Design an enzyme around this catalytic site. Structure first.
Site, short mmCIF file in Angstrom:
data_model
loop_
_atom_site.label_atom_id
_atom_site.label_comp_id
_atom_site.label_asym_id
_atom_site.label_seq_id
_atom_site.Cartn_x
_atom_site.Cartn_y
_atom_site.Cartn_z
N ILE A 97 0.82 -1.21 0.00
CA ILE A 97 0.00 0.00 0.00
C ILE A 97 0.87 1.28 0.00
O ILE A 97 0.61 2.17 -0.80
CB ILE A 97 -1.03 -0.06 1.18
CG1 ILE A 97 -2.12 -1.15 0.91
CG2 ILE A 97 -1.66 1.31 1.46
CD1 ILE A 97 -3.08 -1.45 2.08
N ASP A 108 -5.58 1.99 6.45
CA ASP A 108 -4.97 1.51 7.67
C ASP A 108 -6.02 0.54 8.26
O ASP A 108 -7.15 0.96 8.52
CB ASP A 108 -4.69 2.71 8.62
CG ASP A 108 -4.49 2.33 10.08
OD1 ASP A 108 -3.81 1.32 10.33
OD2 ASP A 108 -5.02 3.03 10.96
N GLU A 118 -1.40 -2.23 10.99
CA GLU A 118 -1.52 -0.89 11.58
C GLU A 118 -0.25 -0.41 12.33
O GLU A 118 0.22 0.69 12.12
CB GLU A 118 -2.74 -0.80 12.50
CG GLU A 118 -2.85 0.55 13.21
CD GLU A 118 -4.21 0.89 13.77
OE1 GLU A 118 -4.69 0.15 14.65
OE2 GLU A 118 -4.75 1.97 13.41
N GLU A 119 0.25 -1.25 13.25
CA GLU A 119 1.40 -0.90 14.08
C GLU A 119 2.61 -0.60 13.24
O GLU A 119 3.35 0.32 13.58
CB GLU A 119 1.68 -1.99 15.14
CG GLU A 119 0.53 -2.15 16.12
CD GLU A 119 -0.53 -3.18 15.79
OE1 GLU A 119 -0.56 -3.69 14.64
OE2 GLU A 119 -1.36 -3.48 16.68
N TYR A 170 7.08 -8.96 8.52
CA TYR A 170 5.76 -8.64 9.05
C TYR A 170 5.60 -9.43 10.32
O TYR A 170 6.05 -10.57 10.38
CB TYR A 170 4.69 -9.11 8.01
CG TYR A 170 3.27 -8.66 8.30
CD1 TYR A 170 2.85 -7.37 7.99
CD2 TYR A 170 2.34 -9.54 8.85
CE1 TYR A 170 1.55 -6.95 8.28
CE2 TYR A 170 1.03 -9.14 9.12
CZ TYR A 170 0.64 -7.84 8.82
OH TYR A 170 -0.66 -7.45 9.05
N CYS A 172 -8.56 -9.36 8.42
CA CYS A 172 -8.23 -10.78 8.28
C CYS A 172 -7.36 -11.33 9.43
O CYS A 172 -6.91 -10.57 10.31
CB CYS A 172 -7.61 -11.07 6.92
SG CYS A 172 -8.41 -12.42 6.02
N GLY A 173 -7.15 -12.65 9.41
CA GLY A 173 -6.34 -13.36 10.39
C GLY A 173 -7.00 -13.48 11.75
O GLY A 173 -8.01 -14.18 11.89
N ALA A 174 -6.43 -12.78 12.76
CA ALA A 174 -6.88 -12.78 14.16
C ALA A 174 -8.34 -12.33 14.37
O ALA A 174 -9.02 -12.88 15.24
CB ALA A 174 -5.94 -11.95 15.02
#
Ligand SMILES: Cc1nc(C)c(Cn2c(=O)n(Cc3cnn(C)c3)c(=O)c3cc(S(O)(O)NC4(C)CC4)ccc32)s1
Length: 501
Positions: A266, A277, A295-296, A335, A412-414
């Protein structure tokens, strides 16, 4: 044969003239607009420090009302006394911070700060840190009353308000957040700021995660850069809350253009575009603590984003935060558990007429689903559509002046989001907001092909936003409403429902 991108070429995607910058009822401007010049450090407005110690403004550490029981003493004087000492060992920095945070002397762990300084850094790097970087950070933090002379309003729930401040003002406030000087922002049982994110950096100093030295290297890269040479630009923070949402079932708007790719990022390949974000409701997520996902990472490489945590209240369902002008100071690889700081970054982005880097970022928080099938519930789908719509809509701006949205696998994911549903939701919200979509699938080539095939299928058949939303309602009703364990996936369901009608 093995195409890295699909759809509209990215060169065909959109990447206007600004009105005069000035303070108004809905716009706080903390610098001298009449003196704003390219390459020159902005002058603060007002000239002399003005204080507000109330429920509607940031409680400044330099405020005369920032007191402590000794007879009430001046906490700012104690801050100056504590920080103006020679740091030669990590214990000296810990001891300094705790002098004006006595209540947290047993609760705050400093292991990561001590391990970074003593066990990660080489002798010369540790020396440069305590002889040059830390004293230069103390000086810009203690300059706060001469830099941030104007009260900073809180971007509270349901407020449609903007703050335009200088990058230099941000550096002074962030150096304060590193030294944990912001009052009333520490208590676990605090009420006044319970709905605001953490701003003081103390959780960055705790524990032994291998990712803490990486976060610290990224932040000290930023601090070294902004203390050596003062940044000259501005940054705007806008809280946006929509009152009127579309009646999705009735939306007659067609779909817009799509560029979908499994390669790129991005921030690199979405230049000049509205950059998403994948936010938490408390903006920045765990940037000042343990989190190291999408984000972090953005908050670390563009640290000016972190100051949004000082004044941005937890986002409600109908709200988003739009940040214009942040600068990329670092480069990285990996990542999450593989994230590593790579080197310093020289941001080549042009500046607009308000001296803001041409980088627009929107924070939109996806829902967290305890169960997978919860996301298919009409109320839950409508919530995600309205959230993305709020982040994408620019009320008053016409379609031809709106850049494409640069996004990817949001929530997505968690958080338990289904990538195929979320991709459709974003495509629909971008259509209603009349913007084209640039979609990054981060190595998932199969997802790129499925998103492309679905988008081209719906476009060729001239299905509107309403037609697609109604198909989503049918999927819930046929495959989720009565499901106890789904039997058939969403995209096969859509192809079947359209092709057999
Ligand atoms: C080409 C690639 N491959 C992998 C594995 C990559 C790392 N990466 C990754 O893993 N995820 C998880 C994921 C989700 N879906 N999938 C399939 C993976 C991401 O979300 C992700 C997001 C970005 S970004 O462009 O948003 N830039 C920032 C990190 C904000 C600054 C960059 C890299 C990312 S980048």
């Amino acid at each position: 044969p093995d195409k890295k991108w699909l759809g509209t070429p990215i060169e065909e995607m959109r990447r206007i003239r600004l009105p005069l910058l000035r303070p108004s009822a809905n716009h706080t401007v903390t610098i001298r607009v009449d003196l704003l010049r390219a390459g020159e450090v902005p002058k603060p407005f007002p000239t002399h420090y003005k204080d507000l110690w109330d429920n509607k403004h940031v409680k400044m550490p330099c405020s005369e009302q920032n007191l402590y029981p000794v007879t009430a003493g001046s906490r700012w004087e104690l801050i100056q006394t504590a920080l103006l000492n020679k740091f030669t060992r990590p214990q000296n920095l810990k001891d300094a911070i705790l002098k004006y945070n006595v209540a947290y002397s047993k609760k705050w762990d400093f292991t990561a700060l001590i391990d970074f300084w003593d066990k990660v850094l080489e002798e010369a790097e540790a020396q440069h840190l305590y002889q040059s970087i830390l004293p230069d950070m103390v000086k810009i933090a203690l300059c706060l009353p001469n830099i941030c002379t104007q009260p900073i309003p809180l971007l509270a729930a349901a407020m449609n308000h903007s703050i335009t401040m200088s990058q230099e003002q941000i550096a002074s406030l962030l150096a304060n957040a590193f030294f944990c000087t912001f009052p009333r922002r520490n208590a676990k049982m605090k009420s006044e700021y319970s709905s605001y994110p953490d701003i003081n950096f103390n959780r960055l100093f705790e524990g032994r995660s291998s990712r803490k030295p990486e976060k610290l290297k990224t932040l000290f890269c930023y601090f070294r850069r902004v203390t050596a040479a003062a940044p000259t630009g501005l940054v705007t923070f806008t809280r946006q809350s929509l009152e009127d949402f579309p009646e999705w079932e009735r939306c007659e708007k067609p779909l817009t253009r799509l560029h979908v790719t499994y390669e790129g990022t991005i921030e690199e390949n979405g230049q000049g575009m509205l950059q998403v974000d994948f936010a938490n409701r408390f903006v920045g997520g765990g940037v000042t603590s343990a989190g190291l996902v999408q984000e972090e990472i953005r908050f670390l490489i563009n640290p000016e984003l972190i100051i949004s945590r000082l004044f941005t209240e937890v986002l409600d369902h109908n709200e988003c935060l739009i940040i214009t002008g942040t600068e990329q100071y670092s480069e990285y690889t990996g990542y999450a558990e593989t994230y590593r700081w790579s080197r310093s970054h020289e941001d080549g982005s042009e500046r607009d007429d308000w001296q803001r880097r041409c980088t627009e970022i929107v924070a939109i928080d996806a829902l967290h689903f305890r169960r997978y099938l919860d996301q298919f519930v009409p109320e839950k789908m409508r919530r995600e559509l309205n959230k993305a719509y709020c982040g994408f809509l620019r009320p008053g701006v016409s379609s031809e002046n709106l850049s494409a949205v640069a996004t990817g696998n949001w929530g997505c994911g968690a958080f338990g989001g289904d990538a195929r549903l979320k991709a459709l939701i974003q495509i629909l919200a971008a259509a209603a907001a009349e913007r084209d979509v640039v979609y990054f699938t981060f190595g998932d080539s199969e997802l790129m092909r499925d998103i492309y095939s679905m988008h081209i299928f719906l476009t060729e058949r001239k299905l509107t936003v309403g037609d697609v939303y109604k198909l989503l309602l049918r999927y819930y009703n046929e495959e989720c409403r009565n499901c106890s364990t789904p039997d058939i996936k969403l995209y096969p369901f859509i192809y079947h429902a359209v092709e057999s009608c």
